[PDB]
Ligand binder design. Structure first.
Ligand SMILES: COc1ccc(S(=O)(=O)N(CC(C)C)C[C@@H](O)[C@H](Cc2ccccc2)NC(=O)O[C@@H]2CC[C@@H]3C[C@H]4CO[C@@H](C)[C@@]42O3)cc1
Ligand SMILES: [Cl-]
Lengths: 99, 99
């Protein structure tokens, strides 16, 4: 698909057996998902945005379906107000910015 | 151009006579630039990201050249770690997300 940017670029994702809405975000290095339970070991991490830093749990090798496209990578879980699909997974579905 | 996302999508902008680097950010509604002096009156705005809220100054109808494309629109000025080009100006230069 080609997605215009008049509105937030939100898509449906499947992660950990649940359906969620998430933002396709070229400004995010990593993918950040609201608090949920995932399997495996995790390590703590601090990530910084506008307004300061938050603590998240880093999970590796997580499978995510993004608008029907399967991808695997690291997912950060923490108190974000919006689910964010970052560059580490956008590259895997072949996403590009065009102008 | 067509910009892949294996690296941060950084571009050169020109604003108020100065060259700066900025991130093309589909996850940002608005455009936010580090502290600088711009012409005209400003208005207050609160913006919220991952780490809380900050107060910024809103300037309207600012000329800005983004990777050689001219845009005229609203720019927010405040303590941001990186200069962010958001959807308000990405739509003016005709940017889309494709996969
Ligand atoms: C290592 O991995 C990461 C991954 C992500 C982040 S990140 O979330 O911190 N970030 C990184 C940028 C700032 C360098 C990704 C950016 O796309 C963010 C996404 C977003 C949208 C909505 C809510 C939270 C986060 N966007 C935003 O902050 O948008 C807000 C939205 C409301 C208004 C409109 C915008 C103009 O100013 C900002 C503060 C905004 O206020 C950092 C590190
Ligand atoms: Cl990854």
């Amino acid at each position: 698909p080609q997605i215009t940017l008049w509105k937030r670029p939100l898509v449906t994702i499947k992660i950990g057996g649940q359906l969620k809405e998430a933002l396709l975000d070229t400004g995010a290095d990593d993918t950040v998902i609201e608090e949920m339970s995932l399997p495996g070991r995790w390590k703590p991490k601090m990530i910084g945005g506008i307004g300061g830093f938050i603590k998240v749990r880093q999970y590796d090798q997580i499978i995510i379906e993004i608008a029907g496209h399967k991808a695997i990578g690291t997912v950060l879980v923490g108190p974000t107000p919006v689910n964010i699909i970052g560059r580490n997974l956008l590259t895997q579905i072949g996403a590009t910015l065009n102008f």
